[PDB]
Structure formats: C-alpha cells, structure tokens
C-alpha cells in the first residue's frame, strides 16, 4: 500500500570455501556497487564493531559464526564514523548532481526511503533497518555453515495466487496514474495557453 514499487536487497558472500578471505557485500538500489556490510551498518548509526556483531549474531559462544564475520570487519576498517560511511555510499550513487555535500544527504535518503522499504520509509527508524539487515546476514551465515538447508523454491507456502481482485487493482492503479498525469498536463496547458 502506497507506492506499489519493488526494490530488491541482496546479501552476497563472495569467495569460495578454498579462499583465504570471504567477505560479505550487499547490493543497495541506486548505488552501482557492492558495499561491505560493516560500512552499511555504520551508515545506519552503528559505529562500534561489537554492536555490529551483536545485531548479526545473537549468541556469544557461537565463535564459528563470529570467525566467518572477522573478514567483514577487517574490510570495513578504514571507515569508523557515521559521516564518512554515508559519504562512501553517496559517492557510489548514480546521481552526479550531488557535488560533495548533498552526497551525505542523498545517501541518507536512499538508506531511508529505498533501503528495505517494507519495514518503513519514515525518518527515525534506523534501528529497525539495522536489526533486519543483521537478520538477513545471520540467515546467510547459517546456511553457509551447513546448519540450515537452502530455502526450497517449490514450497507452496512461499507462493501467492493473484486473483481478479489483485490483478484488476494493479491495472486500475496503473491506469489511474495515467489519468492523474493527464489531468495535470491539462492544467499546465490550460494555465499557460490561457484557455478556459
């Protein structure tokens, strides 16, 4: 309800089992590049490394999961404050209108309105976004450690059937948007051309 657009978030574990360094990078809309998870966490307002792991792993004695998280913090070590983390995200954004100062604000807006929109899109909900991001990372590590099998795509419980209701709703939503756009275009034409 509200915009009907879809944004996809992917958390990717680079490297194979035979590599000496396997990092985790997440894909954010309108960023053009994969950013380490630690930098993203700092951008949300969680600077301390200990707090970063707390959201990801919920067990203190689960050293095996913590060990796999060691490379992630190592990669994102040159950034240690919220302001610099946001700027790093902003520089990768594909706007090219933001020069050097709107970059921080532009990055902040993306993390607020276009990052994990299904939790919320209003200001002041960075804590919720960070906790969900850690949940996604925790699930990824659980499968990577041979503790949980990869989700089955044939599971009927993860599927949805769109009937005439939802099908017509999207059609009406698209057509109504065109009608509203046409209405304003008439207003602009009427105002500028001096027509009744």
């Amino acid at each position: 309800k509200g915009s009907r657009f879809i944004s996809t978030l992917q958390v990717k574990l680079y490297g194979r089992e035979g590599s000496s360094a396997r990092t985790i990078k997440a894909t954010l809309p309108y960023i053009k590049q994969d950013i380490p998870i630690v930098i993203i966490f700092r951008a949300l307002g969680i600077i301390p490394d200990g707090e970063i792991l707390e959201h990801i792993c919920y067990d203190v004695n689960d050293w095996q999961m913590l060990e796999m998280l060691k490379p992630c913090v190592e990669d994102g070590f040159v950034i240690q404050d919220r302001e610099t983390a946001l700027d790093f995200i902003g520089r990768r954004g594909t706007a090219l209108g933001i020069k050097k100062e709107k970059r921080i604000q532009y990055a902040k807006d993306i993390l607020q309105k276009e990052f994990l929109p299904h939790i919320t899109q209003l200001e002041g909900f960075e804590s919720r976004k960070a906790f969900f991001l850690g949940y996604m990372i925790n699930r990824l590590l659980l499968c990577a450690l041979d503790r949980k099998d990869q989700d089955d795509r044939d599971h009927f419980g993860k599927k949805r059937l769109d009937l005439a209701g939802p099908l017509l709703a999207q059609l009406f939503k698209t057509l109504f948007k065109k009608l509203t756009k046409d209405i304003f275009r008439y207003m602009q034409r009427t105002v500028e051309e001096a027509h009744d």
Binding site: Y58, V60, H118, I119, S127, R128, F131, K159, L161, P166
Partner: protein, 98 residues
C-alpha cells in the same frame, strides 16, 4: 482442490497493536545478550519485536482467531525450534479447512 480457498487479506495494523499491548517489547530496546531466549515476532515479514513468553501469546492469539475476533484468514505460525512467531495477513495465501 475442492476445499481449497484463497485469502483476500486484511489490515495487519490491528494485529500489531494487539501484540504491543500483550508484552511485545519494541525492537528499539532489544539487547540479544541480555535475553538470549526471546521469540522474534514477525508480521507480514516485518520484525516488530520480541516476546518473553511465546506460549501465552500464541494461546491468546489462537483463541481470539478461533472465536472470531481475528479474521480466520490470518495465518499464525510458531517455530519453537527457531524461536520465531510469524503472523501472515496478506492476500494470495492458499488455505484449506480442518
């Protein structure tokens, strides 16, 4: 199938407010290390909080659905092993009576 039906979906907000009044701690003050036994509460795939006695919440939630306060189409799942409580209210889910 003959008895198969497809839900039409309802507003999830009434369910969320009910959870808050019955001890669903907000996610803003969740410290995993100070409570490593809480159950994560999910509504339509959104983590809204944690709850210390998932048994009582599930019993209350199930009772309300059965008597009719909560819409029957609302789906409730309690993964005891995973310590997760998932509530689904969106449309398109296929269900059957039992």
């Amino acid at each position: 199938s003959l008895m198969s039906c497809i839900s039409v979906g309802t507003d999830p907000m009434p369910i969320i407010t009910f959870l808050s009044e019955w001890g669903m701690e907000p996610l803003e003050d969740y410290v995993p290390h100070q409570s490593p036994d809480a159950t994560r509460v999910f509504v339509n795939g959104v983590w809204h909080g944690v709850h210390r006695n998932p048994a009582r919440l599930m019993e209350t939630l199930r009772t309300l659905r059965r008597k009719g306060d909560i819409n029957p189409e609302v789906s409730m799942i309690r993964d005891i092993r995973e310590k997760e409580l998932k509530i689904f209210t969106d449309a398109g889910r296929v269900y059957r009576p039992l």
